[PDB]
């Protein structure tokens, strides 16, 4: 498990790292723990939290892409084809760094 996105995410300041990694864990966990709830599979690119606290942060959007999200015009979508396994892998990597 050697993620370029997670390594980049860890290069942020402690404060920003915490803020962004927290959001990333929530996006992952909501899908992992509610796999039949479609509402957790799409994130609006213009959502205030997402656009201001996640997207501007080096490494963070790439963590979503490595999890399996795809970028549409207005949303990032976790598609039907995407494995929980790859999603879980990135969640686990980020959580280690938050405990670290």
């Amino acid at each position: 498990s050697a993620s370029p996105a997670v390594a980049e995410l860890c290069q942020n300041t402690p404060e920003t790292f915490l803020e962004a990694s927290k959001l990333l864990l929530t996006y992952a966990d909501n899908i992992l723990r509610n796999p039949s709830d479609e509402k957790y599979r799409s994130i609006r690119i213009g959502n205030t939290a997402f656009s201001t606290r996640l997207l501007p942060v080096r490494g963070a959007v790439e963590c979503l892409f490595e999890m399996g999200f795809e970028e549409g015009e207005t949303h990032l979508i976790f598609p039907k084809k995407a494995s929980v396994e790859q999603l879980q892998k990135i969640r686990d990597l980020i959580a280690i760094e938050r405990s670290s």
Binding site: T26, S42, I43, A49
Partner: peptide, 5 residues
């Protein structure tokens, strides 16, 4: 704080 919509 809504993260989705």
């Amino acid at each position: 704080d809504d993260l989705y919509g």
